[PDB]
Ligand binder design. Structure first.
Ligand code: TMF
Ligand code: TMF
Ligand code: UMP
Ligand code: UMP
Lengths: 316, 316
């Protein structure tokens, strides 16, 4: 079925992956190197075995394709996947000066001073960001995220180059070139970053009709993480596709450290337990055509029914 | 045998690849997306079915690992793989002022004004570069090649960062991180380049012992091109490996547009015609240890016997 490369790669981390420490000491079963393929005209690649959210992914990528680096658009839509490095700056600031938020992050689940205070301090940081039009700019604006990596990579001699703007040109004009890449690894910025980009590079292809794309995620979390990432670039591939004029072909997901978490063992065993129901259908607003102008309403999802959702505990 | 992922990928471009125009209109059988694996302790990954040259690759990578961007070291060793963009600058210069070299490049094979003149003008450009210590600097010095991409990526605010220097540190100190990348795609520089890097990104891994590496070549020529590239990074992997203290594990070669040339059809049919003799053994100078100090003599090749070499006509 369309989603069986994810399953065949989760039962491959699980019993074939070796135990890696990793950074936040909770161990992995790593493997290094995996290409999995998805042909997108059979249907759309998110999982029917385990509920994955589609308005979140939509709003997020939609957010990355405006080059917008501000959570205030994300909050407006109801997305807060990005919240915690923002707060990492707010509660480490000069203005924070209140009720201690040090390490909020994994003192949570460990209750004590942390379950309702780190959480009261979050709706306090958000709301401020949705309204104070300056609070929004000092802390809610992330600087280096995929919208600036993507559409305003800062040059060595003083300004903004929109990569994806030009690549959507080079597909529109020179379809068949082996240079159609957008890159997120910039090393000025790598040594001093929160999380360096995890979807490091990606290259489009024009088969004859049919745009394809290959990603190089460098680091991948299986169970949590890789359901999400397979769909963002299946949407990117799907959205660039509709703007060049071309049919959709296929998305290749290539990984470096693909690893399942040691929390996520039982939950991934639970998932494999089940059968793929038929892959979902996505349609796109055909009257809009410039993709960077896509209101939310313009990307759609024709019958999706997963199972059950699943709890993995708190990643990082 | 160790080299069968290259064969299984040449009979896969050939009759499974589709006809791509490409840029220099001589057509391809492209495919998009291929991971092939090489475990380097079984032996070394260059081909015994078709003579591939090892002092060229050595001298070249050795050249890239000094961050040296000057052909004058390459010539000194006897390597001229790099010559033609150099001349692309010399014969397009202000100083050229002689006997017309316009398009040397594929007016060659087409004889006429071009077989001994573009070629007399090459030994004239080289020799000058080996001796005039200034000629060497105005035209023999390439600026942007893998030694500056690798070890002096120019920053956005005024200077040189040695990527590979720091990654050999981060392996030496934090072995198990999913960030061990060196990147060659810099977009300031991409729109105005001769050939943008073809081996775009690469990431190391520390399995438990055993350094591994994954490449992302973006564009790959099969028959000519991919015998060479599989060995350069099997040497890089092999050389970084000996400096961290770690055993050698495996090299993953990942491609985007892997394509066989329409010239190279009969010659690749000819190649497949034969049987793998046993994979070669490489040893390294164990008393030297800092890799950036490796004289040529320090990397070695224990029995290699290919077949026959093969002629593919003039690529580009
Ligand atoms: N450097 C970095 N790169 C990424 O791949 C990435 C990142 N961080 N983290 C923030 C964003 C948005 N992405 C994310 C991040 C987290 C989830 C997430 O929480 N999804 C889990 C479910 C977790 C749960 O059970 O609550 C999943 O199953 O995929 C999804 C997408 C990637 N992006
Ligand atoms: N942008 C770019 N990236 C590369 O992969 C690359 C490049 N150009 N071309 C120059 C260097 C050095 N490399 C090269 C270039 C050409 C040959 C070459 O001439 N080798 C052919 C044999 C050609 C013949 O039959 O004379 C082969 O079989 O591999 C080898 C390595 C890659 N490097
Ligand atoms: O939404 C995301 C965020 C992160 N990662 C991963 C996997 C690791 O848990 C995490 C950290 O790895 P490094 O920072 O060491 O690269 O990055 C994903 O797959 N998807
Ligand atoms: O030594 C090399 C040099 C180039 N290439 C390739 C394959 C193509 O023939 C060439 C040009 O592709 P683009 O410039 O369109 O990327 O790059 C290799 O595989 N190895």
């Amino acid at each position: 079925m369309l989603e069986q490369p994810y399953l065949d790669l989760a039962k491959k981390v699980l019993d074939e992956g070796h135990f890696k420490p990793d950074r936040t000491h909770t161990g992995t079963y790593s493997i290094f190197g995996h290409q999995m393929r998805f042909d997108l005209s059979k249907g759309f690649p998110l999982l029917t075995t385990k509920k994955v959210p589609f308005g979140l992914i939509k709003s997020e990528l939609l957010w990355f394709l405006h080059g917008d680096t501000n959570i205030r658009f994300l909050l407006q839509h109801r997305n807060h996947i990005w919240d915690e490095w923002a707060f990492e700056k707010w509660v480490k600031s000069d203005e924070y000066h209140g009720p201690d938020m040090t390490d909020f992050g994994h003192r949570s689940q460990k209750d004590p001073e942390f379950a309702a205070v780190y959480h009261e301090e979050m709706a306090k940081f958000d709301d401020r960001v949705l309204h104070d039009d300056a609070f929004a700019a000092k802390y809610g604006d992330l600087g280096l995220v995929y919208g600036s990596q993507w559409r305003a990579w800062h040059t060595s001699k003083g300004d903004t180059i929109d990569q994806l703007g030009d690549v959507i040109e080079q597909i529109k004009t020179h379809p068949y070139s082996r240079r159609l890449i957008v890159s997120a690894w910039n090393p000025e910025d790598v040594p001093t970053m929160a999380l360096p980009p995890c979807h490091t590079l990606y290259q489009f292809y024009v088969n004859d009709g049919k745009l394809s794309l290959q990603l190089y995620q460098r680091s991948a979390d299986i169970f949590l993480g890789v359901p999400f990432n397979i769909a963002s670039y299946a949407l990117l591939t799907h959205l660039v596709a509709h703007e060049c004029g071309l049919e959709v072909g296929e998305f290749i997901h290539t990984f470096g450290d693909a690893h399942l978490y040691v929390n996520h063992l039982d939950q991934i065993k639970e998932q494999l337990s089940r059968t793929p129901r038929p892959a979902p259908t996505l349609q796109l607003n055909p009257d809009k055509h410039d993709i960077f102008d896509f209101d939310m309403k313009d990307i759609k999802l024709l019958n999706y029914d997963p199972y059950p959702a699943i709890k993995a505990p708190v990643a990082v």
